[PDB]
Structures are given as structure tokens and as C-alpha cells.
Write a protein that binds this ligand. Structure first.
Ligand code: ZZO
Length: 822
């Protein structure tokens, strides 16, 4: 059994477990055994969970951030069902009560023994919440549809559980010996070296003597640093850059001065370098795995006596306000002078005090750490700032996680993408963040699902493949069952890649109708029908993809030729008719981040009672320029609608009426008013979202509209101005908002009110967006690479202003946009 599981993990994670063994690396070895133990203990706890707790693990509640309604309810075993009138204010228990009373009369005669499953979905309604607090019940109300639910008994739930079982002394100036290299270039070589603690230099950047671009270079020279050995902090990073000159960067390499056991490193090292894009402090502290091709630098760390970093017990032994909300040197001195008052009276200003402490003086670090160990826990918002690379110390990182433990699963999920990116800043394999993420993932299967895919989707990136592979292995140890569920998804994705490659070849030699027929024949092979059917959606593990609907599958005969894959499910009814788009060839990371930020805006708006009728559809990178996008059904592009074709319900005398005519056709009679309202609200949401994020090149081919009237955007790829993008009002959109009238200030100014409300709410959470984007810098996105990009957000939310100034500013922009509109 154990051999089978090992091979299944290897295949699932995209890396052979023998490759971990072959490294013969104690740190890897230790990571693997500790984390396996941790994860297996979590699995043991899970298998004895009570049935309500199991539901909470496997099917966490989907909640929203009086009135009557029809609900259809059946029981798990039978066809017979009952359609009740209940209230949106009723609890699930009351609904389960009606259900059981009804079954008792038909079937000739305890609510608390049941949970309600949404038909055809891995989604359950349970707990003390009125029905309309559940996202599913909400969804039905706005769409019109009738909730269809299944009474599931506690013994059925337990059956699912059961089937799823598994030192201060050294004053000499720090120095190294640069021995030799083995590189490729055109000039003379120089090696620049610098010592870093995060972004901050611990002293000046001492450089090599120049040597000719011959060899196999040999230096054999001591590089002494302007810092005492007893002053090197625990997280000291040594950074090299090799380049040529008469500038031409060649390569870079970093390492920690202390190993993962706090021992100071000696003696000789061969550093396998990464090819360059001069110093890269944020770059990984692990060598380039391509040891065949990589340029290499051998260095020597001299034996300073074994020396370890002191234990905490030895460490622990050793106008303010007007500025406190970049600062001058005397201001910094005051903050450090007042550090005790900072702790006692301004605990949330911890980060500011950290940025003023002298990390290159061990005495000062001791004094900072002593305060840190008695520091009260901080709000989640503050802890997110502390995860930044500006805060490299392990005690700080440990404090940060401790304050983040109060994250709800919903919050953790909202920030998961960024927390995974922060792993790229980690210095060692076994770290507090990895343990935190793995623990949360093992306690919540939705978190487990998305953590898996965030890690899996980067296995083709050599710099993270080891770390991410090891995390995925450990996770698998803690849920054998979920591993198999994930394997099924991977098998479907393998088949989709093969199918997409086929379509790419066929469509170059034949017409779209012919290729589509070939696609269908390929899909109807038993191997494909089996691999593509009966899986949890990688986009949302609560959506079950049952039978693939071959005749509705197609492809886009342009660009990367993405696939359109439709599904149906008898058991789920209408809600089982769902689609996925598979695209191979594009980097989906930018799309994913944009969509996640818009989804976050939607949550923040709804928390203030503003529902802009957004369309937060799923986008999930799964592999190398590969991923899935959730299909929004019953929608069309603005461009297609504006073609204004004849013989259609929407055919118009003036082209400006095409979109309104289309909406009229989909929403006859009294339905038009609501659709125009959905259009207006969503238009405001997307106009604000794209303005704030600097998303340019919006046009009629990348905006879509649903038959409900809701507008949404597709195909992102440009943001934070990396095409200053103006606020955009489109004439055809103004025309719909104005109900097809030339002048309609009543409707138009309501729309302006929505924009202003949305904008002011985002500003209030400005710091959250800034902290999240700061963390996202870890991801290596070319459109989020520096301070200029963060500055874009600062400017767009006008955060340096009062609310009144910001709104005047926003108003000029909005007004300028209206003029520009034809
Ligand atoms: C559905 C449609 C109407 C009008 C013009 C184009 C499309 N459309 C679109 C338009 N589109 N794009 C997206 C989409 C959104 C974000 C992306 O990153 C992305 F790659 C695609 C999309 C979506 N999520 N839901 C519904 N429609 C969407 N996408 C296709 C993808 C694969 C295969 C096909 C045949 C299509 C396709 O026909």
C-alpha cells in the first residue's frame, strides 16, 4: 500500500519522491519527517471528528459577507420531494422540521440529526443562520430559481468520514574568501558582494578585484566586511552578483550565514548561480538546481573558533504622535528612545519601530526582541504588514503568524494567494508560515484544495519546485483520500492538455466545423469520457463536474485556442449545467490576481450594504501557462451584441440602441427595469475597480454582459498602468444607464452616486490593498515589480488625502471621463 501511495504522490505533485532522497540533504530530510508527523496527527484528529465538525471540515459554510420563498426538499434515498413555502428569516432547522413532518404523514409516522445538502453540489446548509444568510439561498432569490435541497442524516455523514480514513565573543570584521568560478561571457569580470537583512544593507557592498573574462576564473582573495561577527543577526543573508564591464549582469546567488540549525556556516561553498534578469537580496537563498549548466562561484567561510546563535533566554537576558501616522534620522532616534512607550501606548506601531532598530548591532536587536516577546497581539491588518520581506527576523515572523491565527477561514481564503507567495521569501524549509498553512489546510478541505493548486501550479519554476513539492507531499500524508480526489482532477487536466494540443494542430489544417467534429470524436474515446467526467471542479471543489456534454464542447478558433467544456448533472438539475474553459499558452497569474482583488472589493462593498451585482467567476492557474476559468453562462460580448445583426430581436435603427435592444429582448415587460438596474450597479463596480487597479485597454471584446443585465470583464492582462489610466465612461453604457434617453440626469446621477460610494469604501480599506500588493511582489509578476507599481494604488485611492479632497479629485476624473464619452 505504501509503495502505491508514494507513486501516487509523485505523479500528483509532478515530482518523483526519489528526487528528494537523492539530495541527501539533512534539511530536506528533517523537513520531510517532521511535517509528515505533523500532518499525520492532524489526520488522526480528523477521523474522530463529530458529524457536525466533519461537515465543517469537508463542506465549510458558504455565507454572505420577513419574506416568503418556495423550497423543494427531498430525502437522500427517494425520488419523492416536497415543495414548501418558508421565510427567508427561517432557520434550516425549521425547514428540516417541515420536511420530517411531511415525510411522517406520507410515510405513515429529529431535525437536529440532519443537514441540508444543495442538490448535486458539495455544499450544505446547517447552523443557526436565517436561510437568506446562505449564499445559495441568496443566489436563488436574485436569479428567480427555487432552492432544491436534500435532507441528509448524520449516519450518512459519518459514513463519508469513515470511508475517507488514511557568538557574542567575535569582534573580528566578518570576511570570506572568494576562490574561483566557471562562467560564460564576452571585458573583465567583477564579483560584488553585500550583506543584507531584508531590503537593508548591514554595511557597504565590498567588491572583487577585476579579472579577465578567461576561464574558469580564479580570485583567491579575502573579502572583509564592515561589521563585527558577533553583530551578524540570526537572519543574515550574504548576496553575490557576478557581472562584466569595460554594464552587463551575468548571475547572482544568495545564502544564509547561519544554517537551519542556527550554526554559523564554514568553510567552503560552491554556489550554483542564477542567470541575471545587480544584487538581489529578495532572491532565493538556495542554489540553481541546474548544476550542469549554471555558472558557479566557490567561496570560503573561515572557522571563527561550533558557534550557534544564542537561545532566546540569553537574548532576553541581554512630536512622537505627530510623526507616527519615511522619517528623518532624529525622528528615528526619538522612536527608538521611546520604544517602551511605543509598546505600552502604541502597540500597533510595532512595524515602524522595527524599521528604525539597528539590525546590524546585536545589542540593539537584543533590546528589540525583549520588547517583542511581551508585545500584545496585533490586528490581522497589522500582522499582514509584518509578513513583508522588510521584516526578515524569525521572531518577528513568528509574532506575525501568532497574530494571524485569529484569521477566519473565510479571511484566510481571501488572502491565501498572497500567503503562498510569501513562502518565496522564506530562508529555511521548516518555517512557521508553512506549518500554519499546512495546519489550516488539514483542518479545512477548501483551504487544502486551493493551497494544493497554488503550489502545484508553480512546479515548473525551478526556484520553488523543491519547497512546494515538499509541502504538497506533507499535505498528501495528512489526507490520502483528498490526494485521490486531486489525482482525478490532474488526470482530467492531463487529458485537456492533450485534447487542446490536438485542436491546435487540427485547426491549422482544417475548418473549425471539421476540427470541432474531430474534437468530439477524441472526447468520445473511453479513456477521455472517463478522465473528463465525475470530478470536483478545480475552480470550486463544491461544484461537481459530472457528465461531460460532448456536443456542447467547442474551442475558440483564435489566439491560444482555448477549450469550452460543458457538463451536466441529473441530480443537480439546472445548477449542474456548468462550464469550464481550459487555456494553455497564456500566463493566468495576472487574471487570477485581478479577479481576486475585484472579489475582495465586492466583499468590502457588501459589508457596508452595497451590492454592485458583480460577477466573481473563478480563474485558477494549474500548471505551466495552463489553467481553468469558470464559464459565465447566458452571457455575450458587448462587441458581438454591437454587430447589430439583422433577423434578430435586438436589430436597431441606430447602433447606439443595440445593447439596450438586446437587454429588452432578454427582459421583456416589467423585467426591463431590474436589468437596467443590474447593469447600472455592475457598471459602477467595474468602472471603479478598473480605475483603481489601473486596468487599461478595456474595449467591447473584453467586456461581457449577462442576460440579467450584469456587466463584467474578461481577459485581463494589464494593470497598475502597465499597459496612468483615466476613469472610463463608455457612451453605449451611459445610454443604457439613461434608459435610452439623451438626457436623464436622475438615472445618471444615481449611477455617479454608486461610483462615489464604491470608491469611498475602497479608500477606507486602502491599507489592506497596499499590504496585499506588497506581499504579491514576491510572485515575480512583471507588472508588479517595484515601488512605482505600489505607488499607482496609492495615487488611485488618493490615500494621502482627506475623504473630502479625495472625492473632489475623483469627481474631476469622473467629469473628465463624461466629457470624453463621445
Ligand atoms: C462565450 C463567448 C461569447 C462571445 C464571444 C466569445 C465567447 N467566448 C469566450 C468569452 N469568455 N471569455 C472568458 C474568459 C475570461 C477570463 C479569461 O481569462 C479567459 F481566458 C476567458 C469567459 C468566461 N469566463 N465566461 C464566459 N465567456 C467568456 N471564451 C471562450 C473560451 C473558450 C472557448 C470559446 C468558444 C469561448 C467563447 O466563445
Amino acid at each position: 500500500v505504501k509503495k502505491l501511495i508514494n507513486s501516487q504522490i509523485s505523479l500528483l505533485i509532478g515530482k518523483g519522491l526519489h528526487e528528494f532522497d537523492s539530495l541527501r540533504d539533512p534539511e530536506v530530510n528533517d523537513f520531510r519527517t517532521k511535517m509528515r508527523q505533523f500532518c499525520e496527527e492532524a489526520a488522526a484528529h480528523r477521523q474522530q471528528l463529530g458529524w457536525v465538525e466533519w461537515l465543517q471540515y469537508s463542506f465549510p459554510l458558504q455565507l454572505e459577507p420577513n419574506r416568503a420563498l418556495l423550497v423543494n426538499v427531498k430525502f437522500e434515498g427517494s425520488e419523492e420531494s416536497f415543495t414548501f413555502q418558508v421565510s427567508t428569516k427561517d432557520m434550516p432547522l425549521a425547514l428540516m422540521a417541515c420536511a420530517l413532518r411531511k415525510k411522517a404523514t406520507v410515510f405513515r409516522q429529529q431535525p437536529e440529526e440532519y443537514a441540508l445538502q444543495v442538490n448535486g453540489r458539495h455544499e450544505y446548509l446547517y447552523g443557526n443562520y436565517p436561510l437568506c444568510h446562505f449564499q445559495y439561498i441568496c443566489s436563488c432569490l436574485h436569479s428567480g430559481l427555487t432552492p432544491h435541497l436534500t435532507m441528509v442524516h448524520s449516519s450518512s455523514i459519518l459514513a463519508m468520514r469513515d470511508e475517507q480514513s488514511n557568538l557574542w565573543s567575535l569582534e573580528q570584521p566578518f570576511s570570506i574568501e572568494l576562490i574561483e568560478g566557471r562562467k560564460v561571457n564576452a571585458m573583465k569580470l567583477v564579483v560584488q558582494a553585500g550583506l543584507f537583512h531584508g531590503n537593508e544593507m548591514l554595511c557597504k557592498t565590498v567588491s572583487s578585484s577585476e579579472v579577465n573574462v578567461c576561464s574558469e576564473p580564479v580570485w583567491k582573495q579575502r573579502l572583509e566586511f564592515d561589521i563585527s561577527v558577533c553583530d551578524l543577526p540570526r537572519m543574515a543573508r550574504l548576496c553575490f552578483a557576478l557581472y562584466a564591464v569595460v554594464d552587463c549582469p551575468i548571475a547572482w546567488a544568495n545564502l544564509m550565514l547561519f544554517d537551519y540549525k542556527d550554526q554559523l556556516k564554514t568553510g567552503e561553498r560552491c554556489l550554483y548561480m542564477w542567470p541575471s534578469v545587480l544584487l538581489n537580496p529578495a532572491g532565493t537563498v538556495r542554489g540553481n538546481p541546474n548544476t550542469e549548466s549554471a555558472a558557479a562561484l566557490v567561496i570560503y567561510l573561515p572557522e571563527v573558533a561550533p558557534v550557534y546563535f544564542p537561545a532566546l533566554e540569553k537574548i532576553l537576558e541581554l512630536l512622537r504622535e505627530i510623526l507616527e501616522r519615511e522619517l528623518y534620522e532624529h525622528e528615528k532616534d526619538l522612536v527608538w528612545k521611546m520604544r517602551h512607550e511605543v509598546q505600552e501606548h502604541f502597540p500597533e506601531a510595532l512595524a515602524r519601530l522595527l524599521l528604525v532598530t539597528k539590525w546590524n548591532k546585536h545589542e540593539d536587536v537584543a533590546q528589540m526582541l525583549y520588547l517583542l516577546c511581551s508585545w500584545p497581539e496585533l490586528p490581522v491588518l497589522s500582522a499582514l504588514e509584518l509578513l513583508d520581506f522588510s521584516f526578515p527576523d524569525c521572531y518577528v515572523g513568528s509574532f506575525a503568524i501568532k497574530s494571524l491565527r485569529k484569521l477566519t477561514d473565510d479571511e484566510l481564503f481571501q488572502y491565501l494567494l498572497q500567503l503562498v507567495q510569501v513562502l518565496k521569501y522564506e530562508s529555511y524549509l521548516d518555517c512557521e508560515l508553512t506549518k500554519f498553512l499546512l495546519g489550516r489546510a488539514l483542518a479545512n478541505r477548501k483551504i487544502g484544495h486551493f493551497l494544493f493548486w497554488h503550489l502545484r501550479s508553480e512546479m515548473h519554476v525551478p526556484s520553488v519546485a523543491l519547497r512546494f513539492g515538499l509541502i504538497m507531499e506533507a499535505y498528501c500524508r495528512g489526507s490520502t483520500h483528498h490526494m485521490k480526489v486531486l489525482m482525478k482532477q490532474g488526470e482530467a487536466l492531463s487529458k485537456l492538455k492533450a485534447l487542446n494540443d490536438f485542436v491546435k494542430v487540427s485547426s491549422q489544417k482544417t475548418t473549425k466545423p471539421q476540427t470541432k467534429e474531430m474534437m468530439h470524436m477524441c472526447m468520445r474515446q473511453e479513456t477521455y469520457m472517463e478522465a473528463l467526467s465525475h470530478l470536483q471542479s478545480p475552480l470550486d471543489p463544491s461544484t461537481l463536474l459530472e457528465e461531460v456534454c460532448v456536443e456542447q464542447c467547442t474551442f475558440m478558433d483564435s489566439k491560444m485556442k482555448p477549450l469550452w467544456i460543458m457538463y451536466s448533472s441529473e441530480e443537480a438539475g439546472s445548477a449542474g449545467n456548468v462550464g469550464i474553459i481550459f487555456k494553455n499558452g497564456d500566463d493566468l497569474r495576472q487574471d487570477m490576481l485581478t479577479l481576486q482583488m475585484i472579489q475582495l472589493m465586492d466583499v468590502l462593498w457588501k459589508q457596508e450594504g452595497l451590492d454592485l451585482r458583480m460577477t466573481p467567476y473563478g480563474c485558477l492557474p494549474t500548471g505551466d501557462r495552463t489553467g481553468l476559468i469558470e464559464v459565465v453562462l447566458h452571457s455575450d460580448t458587448i462587441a458581438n451584441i454591437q454587430l447589430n445583426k439583422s433577423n434578430m430581436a435586438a436589430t436597431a435603427a441606430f447602433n447606439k440602441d443595440a445593447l439596450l435592444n438586446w437587454l429588452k429582448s432578454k427582459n421583456p415587460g416589467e423585467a426591463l427595469d431590474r436589468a437596467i438596474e443590474e447593469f447600472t450597479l455592475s457598471c459602477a463596480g467595474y468602472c471603479v475597480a478598473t480605475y483603481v487597479l489601473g486596468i487599461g485597454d478595456r474595449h467591447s471584446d473584453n467586456i461581457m454582459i449577462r442576460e440579467s443585465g450584469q456587466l463584467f470583464h474578461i481577459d485581463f492582462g494589464h494593470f497598475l498602468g502597465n499597459f496612468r489610466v483615466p476613469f472610463i465612461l463608455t457612451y453605449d453604457f451611459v445610454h443604457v444607464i439613461q434608459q435610452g434617453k439623451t438626457n436623464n440626469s436622475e438615472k445618471f446621477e444615481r449611477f455617479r452616486g454608486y461610483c462615489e460610494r464604491a470608491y469611498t469604501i475602497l479608500r477606507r480599506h486602502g491599507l489592506l490593498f497596499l499590504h496585499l500588493f506588497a506581499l504579491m511582489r514576491a510572485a515575480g509578476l512583471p507588472e508588479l515589480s517595484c515601488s512605482k507599481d505600489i505607488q499607482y494604488l496609492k495615487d488611485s485611492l488618493a490615500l494621502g488625502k482627506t475623504e473630502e479632497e479625495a472625492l473632489k479629485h475623483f469627481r474631476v476624473k469622473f467629469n473628465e471621463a463624461l466629457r470624453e464619452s463621445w
